[PDB]
Amino acid sequence: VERIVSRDIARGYERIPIPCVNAVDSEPCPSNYKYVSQNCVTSPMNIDRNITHLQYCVCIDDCSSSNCMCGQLSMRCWYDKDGRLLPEFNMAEPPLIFECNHACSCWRNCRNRVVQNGLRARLQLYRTRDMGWGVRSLQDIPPGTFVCEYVGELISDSEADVREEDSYLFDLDNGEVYCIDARFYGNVSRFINHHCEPNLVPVRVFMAHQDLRFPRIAFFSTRLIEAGEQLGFDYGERFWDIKGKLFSCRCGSPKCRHS
Amino acid sequence: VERIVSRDIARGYERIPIPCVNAVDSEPCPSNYKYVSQNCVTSPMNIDRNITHLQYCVCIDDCSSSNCMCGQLSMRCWYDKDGRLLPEFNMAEPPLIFECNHACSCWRNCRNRVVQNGLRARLQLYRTRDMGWGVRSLQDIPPGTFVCEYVGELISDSEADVREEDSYLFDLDEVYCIDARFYGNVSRFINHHCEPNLVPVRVFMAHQDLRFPRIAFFSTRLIEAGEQLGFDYGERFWDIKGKLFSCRCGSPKCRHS
Numbered sequence: 302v303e304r305i306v307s308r309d310i311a312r313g314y315e316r317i318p319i320p321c322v323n324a325v326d327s328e329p330c331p332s333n334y335k336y337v338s339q340n341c342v343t344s345p346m347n348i349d350r351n352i353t354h355l356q357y358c359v360c361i362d363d364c365s366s367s368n369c370m371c372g373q374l375s376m377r378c379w380y381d382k383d384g385r386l387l388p389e390f391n392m393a394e395p396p397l398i399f400e401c402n403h404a405c406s407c408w409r410n411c412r413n414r415v416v417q418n419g420l421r422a423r424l425q426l427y428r429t430r431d432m433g434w435g436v437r438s439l440q441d442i443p444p445g446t447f448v449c450e451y452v453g454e455l456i457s458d459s460e461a462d463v464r465e466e467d468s469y470l471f472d473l474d475n476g477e478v479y480c481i482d483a484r485f486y487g488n489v490s491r492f493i494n495h496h497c498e499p500n501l502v503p504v505r506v507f508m509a510h511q512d513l514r515f516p517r518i519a520f521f522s523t524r525l526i527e528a529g530e531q532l533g534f535d536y537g538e539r540f541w542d543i544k545g546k547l548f549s550c551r552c553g554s555p556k557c558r559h560s
Numbered sequence: 561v562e563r564i565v566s567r568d569i570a571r572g573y574e575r576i577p578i579p580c581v582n583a584v585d586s587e588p589c590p591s592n593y594k595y596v597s598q599n600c601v602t603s604p605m606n607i608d609r610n611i612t613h614l615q616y617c618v619c620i621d622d623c624s625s626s627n628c629m630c631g632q633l634s635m636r637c638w639y640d641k642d643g644r645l646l647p648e649f650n651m652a653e654p655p656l657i658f659e660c661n662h663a664c665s666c667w668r669n670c671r672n673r674v675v676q677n678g679l680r681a682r683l684q685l686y687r688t689r690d691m692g693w694g695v696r697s698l699q700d701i702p703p704g705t706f707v708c709e710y711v712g713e714l715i716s717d718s719e720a721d722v723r724e725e726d727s728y729l730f731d732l733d734e735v736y737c738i739d740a741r742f743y744g745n746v747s748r749f750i751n752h753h754c755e756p757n758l759v760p761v762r763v764f765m766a767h768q769d770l771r772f773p774r775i776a777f778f779s780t781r782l783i784e785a786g787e788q789l790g791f792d793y794g795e796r797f798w799d800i801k802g803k804l805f806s807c808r809c810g811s812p813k814c815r816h817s
């Protein structure tokens with residue numbers, strides 16, 4: 302039987318609750334971490350927050366025209382009127398997305414604002430049969446929809462190199478390299494399992510700052526995700542080059558690349 | 561006749577619009593600054609944001625008990641269920657307020673969260689007869705209500721010392737200032753009053769770096785619909801500006817006329 306072990310692992314910090322259920326075993330709701338809805342630091346990260354360093358737009362409309370400077374930075378604004386990625390968006394090789402910010406002349410409800418509006422999809426933490434906890438959608442999610450951000454503790458590469466527990470790390474590549482470590486502090490994304498044919502793709506996004514060492518990681522759906530479906534993203538080759546020595550992929554794809 | 565010269569000076573960044581009207585002269589809506597709804601910086605302020613440095617509570621309820629650490633840091637939680645300051649709150653000499661934060665065990669709707677939820681009151685930028693632009697409340701505001709935050713550019717005292725325009729400065733007692741001259745929210749337009757209906761309170765939310773309190777204005781009394789907002793700019797302002805002009809707040813108890 303399916304036990305509800307939390308009505309909201311986010312304790313009201315997201316726009317929607319994210320409940321946790323367990324229909325597999327007697328494991329209680331995960332508690333060996335702290336849920337945070339936004340990135341945090343321990344050691345200082347000198348993120349450039351000088352407001353005069355932001356590039357911004359001077360649009361007089363809703364930023365849906367060809368002329369939006371923020372769109373231009375992104376190659377073009379990739380968001381349609383519903384906040385979804387255009388069909389032309391390259392899922393195999395995503396551009397950097399620069400959303401509008403507080404220095405722009407446009408209004409807070411302009412078109413070029415999606416990730417900064419936060420998590421909206423109805424998600425659920427659940428106990429899988431064979432790879433611990435995972436995350437599923439409770440609803441249909443159309444292609445190109447923002448699902449969630451990979452949130453955690455921003456750390457340097459040298460700090461990551463002395464952290465024994467590296468199973469919750471996302472690399473932010475650049476010669477100055479940083480990571481998000483979601484082991485001790487993280488949001489719902491820390492529970493998303495690896496899939497070799499993933500229904501999510503991580504996109505580098507800039508909002509309140511444009512410090513290129515610290516993109517934020519926004520997962521968008523790569524296809525229609527049907528209600529009940531487990532979320533997955535491709536953890537990438539560094540992960541598997543390390544953990545492949547310890548276990549093989551159980552994503553079960555007929556095209557699995559790490560089995 | 562009362563001309564609407566902006567439907568919202570905040571351009572959608574507050575919960576509700578903050579229109580600007582002018583029934584006095586031909587001045588357009590102020591435009592020589594950038595509206596921001598949260599504090600910003602130019603030069604880096606090394607604010608301590610180490611999450612393990614936060615003090616936090618382990619409450620399993622709605623933080624209405626005296627066991628709440630954040631309440632104890634505040635001396636007690638000063639908020640009733642409506643987010644208003646209790647009658648016993650010392651308006652003449654306010655304590656620091658530590659609101660709950662993201663390190664606390666409690667929920668995002670606990671009792672000890674008010675300023676972090678942002679501006680709610682219906683305000684209006686308007687042209688006064690005697691002292692330029694001012695801010696009024698469009699509705700009744702009960703005593704002890706959070707009205708708005710003094711928002712602007714965080715700068716050092718030494719940076720403040722080399723800025724020409726010091727008329728939009730709020731001292732955070734090495735010391736720091738909020739300068740709302742170039743970047744600021746609606747609070748930059750609030751005029752001085754010697755018997756003020758607002759009091760500034762130092763509040764801590766996402767960080768507890770005591771060098772950088774955030775400045776929250778709370779009502780000191782019932783503010784009736786249509787009333788101009790005012791706070792006491794303090795002695796340093798008037799020590800300087802009193803050489804140039806006198807206070808026109810019009811109070812029978814005016815201390816700077």
Ligand SMILES: COc1cc2nc(N3CCOCC3)nc(NC3CCN(C)CC3)c2cc1OC
Pocket residue numbers: 458459461462463464465467468470471472478480536537539540541543544
């Ligand atoms: C995306 O998945 C992973 C990324 C990882 N990234 C790093 N660094 C970033 C580059 O710069 C060196 C660090 N280190 C790991 N592991 C280190 C290797 C060295 N070890 C002593 C500590 C843990 C990772 C592991 C990952 O998954 C298993």
Ligand SMILES: COc1cc2nc(N3CCOCC3)nc(NC3CCN(C)CC3)c2cc1OC
Pocket residue numbers: 717718720721722723724726727729730731735737793794796797798800801
């Ligand atoms: C609360 O209102 C004010 C605060 C002010 N604070 C400072 N500081 C200087 C550095 O230590 C303390 C904060 N300077 C001001 N004025 C100037 C800055 C320009 N300087 C040429 C002369 C002193 C101020 C002025 C104020 O209103 C007029």
Ligand SMILES: C[S@@+](CC[C@H](N)C(=O)[O-])C[C@H]1O[C@@H](n2cnc3c(N)ncnc32)[C@H](O)[C@@H]1O
Pocket residue numbers: 432433434435468469491492493494495496544548549550551552
């Ligand atoms: C970020 S976590 C995902 C959440 C994890 N299932 C849990 O219960 O905490 C990464 C770990 O989950 C397991 N995992 C995720 N995807 C997997 C996969 N495709 N095959 C095998 N194990 C996987 C591995 O132990 C991996 O180190």
Ligand SMILES: C[S@@+](CC[C@H](N)C(=O)[O-])C[C@H]1O[C@@H](n2cnc3c(N)ncnc32)[C@H](O)[C@@H]1O
Pocket residue numbers: 691692693694727728748749750751752753801805806807808809
């Ligand atoms: C922070 S601003 C307030 C907004 C200002 N009225 C405007 O039009 O931008 C401070 C300035 O407003 C004027 N002011 C504010 N309160 C005043 C008062 N009580 N008496 C006279 N002038 C005042 C003074 O010129 C003061 O330097």
Ligand SMILES: [Zn+2]
Pocket residue numbers: 358359360363364369370371372401405407413
């Ligand atoms: Zn634009």
Ligand SMILES: [Zn+2]
Pocket residue numbers: 358360363364401402405407408411412413
């Ligand atoms: Zn825009």
Ligand SMILES: [Zn+2]
Pocket residue numbers: 357358359364370371400401402405406407413
């Ligand atoms: Zn823009």
Ligand SMILES: [Zn+2]
Pocket residue numbers: 496497550551552553554556557558559560
């Ligand atoms: Zn696989």
Ligand SMILES: [Zn+2]
Pocket residue numbers: 617618619622623628629630631660664666
């Ligand atoms: Zn508490």
Ligand SMILES: [Zn+2]
Pocket residue numbers: 616617618623628629630659660661664665666672
């Ligand atoms: Zn607390």
Ligand SMILES: [Zn+2]
Pocket residue numbers: 617619622623660664666667670671672
């Ligand atoms: Zn609380």
Ligand SMILES: [Zn+2]
Pocket residue numbers: 753754807808809810811813814815816817
């Ligand atoms: Zn006066």
